[PDB]
Write a protein that binds this ligand. Structure first.
Ligand SMILES: Nc1ccccc1N1CCOCC1
Ligand SMILES: Nc1ccccc1N1CCOCC1
Length: 284
């Protein structure tokens, strides 16, 4: 069923809450035993948001390999994403260890450091060129190279150095700065423009490790970003673009991380983004 007609049918019938609860009921339940070990309590921002054991990213260290992060591998679309929480004061070194070990080119941030008067993630990148950051626990150095501030997003060039080997890599930081404190954007136009800037950078391409994507918990806004990207790529690849079922793609992604798309409003917004993005890249 053409999702644009499915969309109008749900709107006219006001059944977004009912559709969303059906997804919640059908979603996968896999163990998260490593996340719940007592040694890992200060590595989790939220007690109810944990990576599954089967899809969790492992740090390359013998001490404690745990980070709150999941590999979402989309087989038909040929895209992979790492979805992670906003870094905590004691996990900023782990965060950049993961970027280095997974060979990521891009970090996508969908939150502000402060929202609703509370801290939603650590200040984990340098704000001035001449004041670099050293992460002594993981032996990394991070330098701000350049910053480009736009009305709806900021792009930063960062240099990450492995102090053990003196190898260096360019990381691109894509920061969507205008998601409102409550609810979802009225139009998906700025969010789609942002998704197209990340694509144009190479950060989502198979010559690199998976893109790292986060918000505060790494399931809601982060879920909307990967769901919209994957649905648009499938509409390009298939003979019948109308065969793409957004609810089925979301359930596939929920096999790899719990709770992706946190509200019926986020579900409606994901539908709007895919419908408007399809008719921009193409039409109909
Ligand atoms: N410790 C900390 C907590 C919250 C955010 C950033 C950091 N930085 C780590 C590396 O040295 C500069 C500060
Ligand atoms: N200059 C450099 C040398 C060797 C590896 C990577 C880089 N980067 C290029 C873009 O700015 C961030 C760092």
């Amino acid at each position: 069923m053409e999702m644009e007609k499915e969309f109008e049918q749900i709107d006219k019938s006001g059944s977004w809450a009912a559709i969303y609860q059906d997804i919640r009921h059908e979603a996968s339940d896999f163990p998260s035993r490593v996340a719940k070990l007592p040694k890992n309590k200060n590595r989790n921002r939220y007690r109810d948001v944990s990576p599954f054991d089967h899809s969790r990213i492992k740090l390359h260290q013998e001490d404690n390999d745990y980070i709150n992060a999941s590999l979402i591998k989309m087989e038909e679309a040929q895209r992979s994403y790492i979805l992670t929480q906003g870094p905590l004061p004691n996990t900023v070194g782990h965060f950049w260890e993961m970027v280095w070990e997974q060979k990521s080119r891009g970090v996508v941030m969908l939150n502000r450091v402060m929202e609703k008067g509370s801290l939603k993630c650590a200040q984990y990148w340098p704000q001035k060129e001449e004041k670099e950051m050293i992460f002594e626990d993981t032996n990394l150095k991070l330098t701000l190279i350049s910053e480009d501030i736009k009305s709806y997003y900021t792009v930063r060039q960062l240099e990450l150095e492995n102090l053990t080997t003196q190898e260096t890599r360019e990381i691109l930081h894509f920061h969507y700065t205008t998601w409102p404190d409550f609810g979802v954007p009225e139009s998906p136009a700025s969010f789609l423009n942002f998704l197209f800037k990340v694509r144009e950078s190479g950060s989502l391409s198979p010559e690199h490790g998976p893109v790292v994507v986060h918000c505060s918990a790494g399931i809601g806004r982060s879920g909307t970003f990967c769901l919209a990207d994957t649905c648009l790529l499938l509409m390009d690849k298939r003979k019948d673009p109308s065969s793409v079922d957004i609810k089925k793609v979301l359930l596939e992604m929920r096999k790899f991380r719990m709770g992706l798309i946190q509200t019926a409003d986020q579900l409606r917004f994901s539908y709007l983004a895919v419908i408007e993005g399809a008719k921009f890249i193409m039409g109909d």
